[PDB]
Design an enzyme around this catalytic site. Structure first.
Site, PDB file in Angstrom:
ATOM      1  N   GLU A 102    -149.624-117.222 -13.899  1.00  0.00           N
ATOM      2  CA  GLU A 102    -150.803-116.902 -13.098  1.00  0.00           C
ATOM      3  C   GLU A 102    -152.128-116.876 -13.858  1.00  0.00           C
ATOM      4  O   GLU A 102    -152.132-116.726 -15.096  1.00  0.00           O
ATOM      5  CB  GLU A 102    -150.624-115.503 -12.478  1.00  0.00           C
ATOM      6  CG  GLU A 102    -149.490-115.477 -11.470  1.00  0.00           C
ATOM      7  CD  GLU A 102    -148.131-115.144 -12.073  1.00  0.00           C
ATOM      8  OE1 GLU A 102    -147.935-115.168 -13.297  1.00  0.00           O
ATOM      9  OE2 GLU A 102    -147.264-114.603 -11.362  1.00  0.00           O
ATOM     10  N   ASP A 140    -143.923-126.504  11.138  1.00  0.00           N
ATOM     11  CA  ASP A 140    -145.379-126.351  11.310  1.00  0.00           C
ATOM     12  C   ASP A 140    -145.964-125.338  10.314  1.00  0.00           C
ATOM     13  O   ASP A 140    -145.216-124.619   9.596  1.00  0.00           O
ATOM     14  CB  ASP A 140    -145.609-125.801  12.710  1.00  0.00           C
ATOM     15  CG  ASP A 140    -147.035-126.008  13.195  1.00  0.00           C
ATOM     16  OD1 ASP A 140    -147.312-125.755  14.399  1.00  0.00           O
ATOM     17  OD2 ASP A 140    -147.820-126.702  12.506  1.00  0.00           O
ATOM     18  N   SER A 141    -147.264-125.253  10.278  1.00  0.00           N
ATOM     19  CA  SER A 141    -147.835-124.231   9.424  1.00  0.00           C
ATOM     20  C   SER A 141    -148.156-122.976  10.230  1.00  0.00           C
ATOM     21  O   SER A 141    -148.184-122.982  11.490  1.00  0.00           O
ATOM     22  CB  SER A 141    -149.068-124.761   8.661  1.00  0.00           C
ATOM     23  OG  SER A 141    -149.893-125.468   9.559  1.00  0.00           O
ATOM     24  N   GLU A 186    -149.435-119.570  -8.915  1.00  0.00           N
ATOM     25  CA  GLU A 186    -148.383-118.686  -8.336  1.00  0.00           C
ATOM     26  C   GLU A 186    -147.191-119.519  -7.920  1.00  0.00           C
ATOM     27  O   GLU A 186    -147.470-120.587  -7.344  1.00  0.00           O
ATOM     28  CB  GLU A 186    -148.858-117.962  -7.073  1.00  0.00           C
ATOM     29  CG  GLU A 186    -150.038-116.979  -7.318  1.00  0.00           C
ATOM     30  CD  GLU A 186    -149.515-115.674  -7.925  1.00  0.00           C
ATOM     31  OE1 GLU A 186    -149.973-114.526  -7.615  1.00  0.00           O
ATOM     32  OE2 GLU A 186    -148.325-115.726  -8.232  1.00  0.00           O
ATOM     33  N   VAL A 241    -144.447-111.264  -7.376  1.00  0.00           N
ATOM     34  CA  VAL A 241    -144.160-110.864  -8.748  1.00  0.00           C
ATOM     35  C   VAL A 241    -144.917-111.739  -9.756  1.00  0.00           C
ATOM     36  O   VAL A 241    -145.110-112.970  -9.545  1.00  0.00           O
ATOM     37  CB  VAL A 241    -142.645-110.859  -9.073  1.00  0.00           C
ATOM     38  CG1 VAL A 241    -141.763-110.738  -7.842  1.00  0.00           C
ATOM     39  CG2 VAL A 241    -142.178-111.862 -10.124  1.00  0.00           C
ATOM     40  N   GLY A 286    -156.405-122.455   5.450  1.00  0.00           N
ATOM     41  CA  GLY A 286    -157.122-122.815   4.229  1.00  0.00           C
ATOM     42  C   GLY A 286    -156.406-123.641   3.187  1.00  0.00           C
ATOM     43  O   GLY A 286    -157.113-124.274   2.353  1.00  0.00           O
ATOM     44  N   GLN A 302    -149.442-118.519  10.520  1.00  0.00           N
ATOM     45  CA  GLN A 302    -150.212-117.402   9.933  1.00  0.00           C
ATOM     46  C   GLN A 302    -149.895-117.128   8.461  1.00  0.00           C
ATOM     47  O   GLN A 302    -148.717-116.963   8.080  1.00  0.00           O
ATOM     48  CB  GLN A 302    -150.125-116.139  10.813  1.00  0.00           C
ATOM     49  CG  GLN A 302    -151.063-116.177  12.013  1.00  0.00           C
ATOM     50  CD  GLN A 302    -150.551-117.211  13.004  1.00  0.00           C
ATOM     51  OE1 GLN A 302    -149.366-117.090  13.374  1.00  0.00           O
ATOM     52  NE2 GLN A 302    -151.482-117.760  13.757  1.00  0.00           N
ATOM     53  N   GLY A 303    -150.891-117.346   7.618  1.00  0.00           N
ATOM     54  CA  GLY A 303    -150.841-117.222   6.162  1.00  0.00           C
ATOM     55  C   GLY A 303    -151.260-118.478   5.413  1.00  0.00           C
ATOM     56  O   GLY A 303    -151.290-118.456   4.152  1.00  0.00           O
ATOM     57  N   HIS A 346    -162.744-119.901   8.350  1.00  0.00           N
ATOM     58  CA  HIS A 346    -162.318-118.614   8.985  1.00  0.00           C
ATOM     59  C   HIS A 346    -161.572-117.697   8.027  1.00  0.00           C
ATOM     60  O   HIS A 346    -161.296-116.521   8.344  1.00  0.00           O
ATOM     61  CB  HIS A 346    -161.650-118.790  10.366  1.00  0.00           C
ATOM     62  CG  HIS A 346    -160.244-119.425  10.167  1.00  0.00           C
ATOM     63  ND1 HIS A 346    -160.008-120.809  10.222  1.00  0.00           N
ATOM     64  CD2 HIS A 346    -159.101-118.806   9.814  1.00  0.00           C
ATOM     65  CE1 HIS A 346    -158.645-121.007   9.850  1.00  0.00           C
ATOM     66  NE2 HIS A 346    -158.112-119.724   9.597  1.00  0.00           N
ATOM     67  N   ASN A 382    -143.979-117.034  -6.776  1.00  0.00           N
ATOM     68  CA  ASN A 382    -143.791-115.781  -6.037  1.00  0.00           C
ATOM     69  C   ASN A 382    -145.056-114.903  -6.107  1.00  0.00           C
ATOM     70  O   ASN A 382    -145.458-114.540  -7.233  1.00  0.00           O
ATOM     71  CB  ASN A 382    -142.608-115.020  -6.702  1.00  0.00           C
ATOM     72  CG  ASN A 382    -142.227-113.831  -5.846  1.00  0.00           C
ATOM     73  OD1 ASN A 382    -143.062-113.115  -5.259  1.00  0.00           O
ATOM     74  ND2 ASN A 382    -141.060-113.331  -6.063  1.00  0.00           N
TER      75      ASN A 382
HETATM   76 CA   LIG Z   1    -146.751-114.681  -9.256  1.00  0.00          CA
END
Ligand SMILES: [Ca+2]
Lengths: 58, 223
Positions: free
Chosen positions: B62, B171-172, B52, B57, B178, B174-175, B40, B54
């Protein structure tokens, strides 16, 4: 114009953070909201313009 | 009271952020070119962000790499959420270091009461809106099939499992969709769905990865 246009926005049970648009009749505008990824209702548009085309006038 | 904790920079080196202009979903690095995520989470124009902490920033660890392909499981049902698994091939292969590393697929299914690490950039507030800059971690055990099916009647297929605390609070949300449920080194779950987040008697629901391991190896190999 419609009736699904008056419904409140539905995030749903999925856990994505997808930004979608809904017609906010009290404002008289299309706003953004966090859509979970699944089981959308009809007041859920991928752009402001599809929102205003479909709903604006309700 | 926020159920989880800030893992610390680059300590879940297999966690990725899927970006389409902003963070919308997570995922796991399973090799130098392949990512596993939820069905989804499928969108056009995915960029994968690797290394990553943050997500707002640029910290210098990265590697941002576009997807070349996105393969949603052929049998995903968007009403039942069954088979909620996707693979994403990077445009070019990441370079694997100690802040970017991949996570092993399992050889067996974890049992009930196995303690796992769930990670993600998702909403840290059960009621409310508060998406953090930095990655959050959550140690949650796996729940029995019986009590997942009692939590959500008529909604759990063989390809789902529950995890977390019937009390609520951790819990996990929204965000997080996946991203990984890693148990004893192995990738066991993909954050998927729930009745809200961190509600009493409604644990989060996850894709059971242990069932897909053949499908994954053979799809990576033939793409
Ligand atoms: Ca970053």
């Amino acid at each position: 114009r419609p009736d699904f246009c008056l419904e409140p926005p539905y995030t749903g049970p999925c856990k994505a953070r997808i930004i979608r648009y809904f017609y906010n009749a009290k404002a008289g505008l299309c706003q953004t909201f966090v859509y979970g990824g699944c089981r959308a209702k009809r007041n859920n548009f991928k752009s402001a313009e599809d929102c205003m085309r479909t709903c604006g006038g309700a | 009271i926020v159920g989880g904790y800030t893992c610390g920079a680059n300590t879940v080196p297999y966690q990725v952020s899927l970006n389409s202009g902003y963070h919308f979903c997570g995922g796991s690095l399973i090799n130098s070119q392949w990512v596993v995520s939820a069905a989804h989470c499928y969108k056009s124009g995915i960029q994968v962000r690797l290394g990553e902490d943050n997500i707002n920033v640029v910290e210098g660890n990265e590697q941002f790499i576009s997807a070349s392909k996105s393969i949603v499981h052929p049998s995903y049902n968007s009403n039942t959420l069954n088979n909620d698994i996707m693979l994403i091939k990077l445009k070019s292969a990441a370079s694997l270091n100690s802040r970017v590393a991949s996570i092993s697929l399992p050889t067996s299914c974890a049992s009930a009461g196995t303690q796992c690490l769930i990670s993600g950039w998702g909403n840290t507030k059960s009621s409310g809106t508060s998406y953090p800059d930095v990655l959050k971690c959550l140690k949650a055990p796996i729940l029995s099939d019986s009590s997942c099916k009692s939590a959500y009647p008529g909604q759990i297929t063989s390809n789902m499992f529950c995890a977390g605390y019937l009390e609520g609070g951790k819990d996990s949300c929204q965000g997080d969709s996946g991203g990984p449920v890693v148990c004893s080194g192995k990738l066991q779950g993909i954050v998927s769905w729930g009745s809200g987040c961190a509600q009493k008697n409604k644990p989060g629901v996850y894709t059971k990865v242990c069932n897909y391991v053949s499908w994954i190896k053979q799809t990576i190999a033939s793409n």
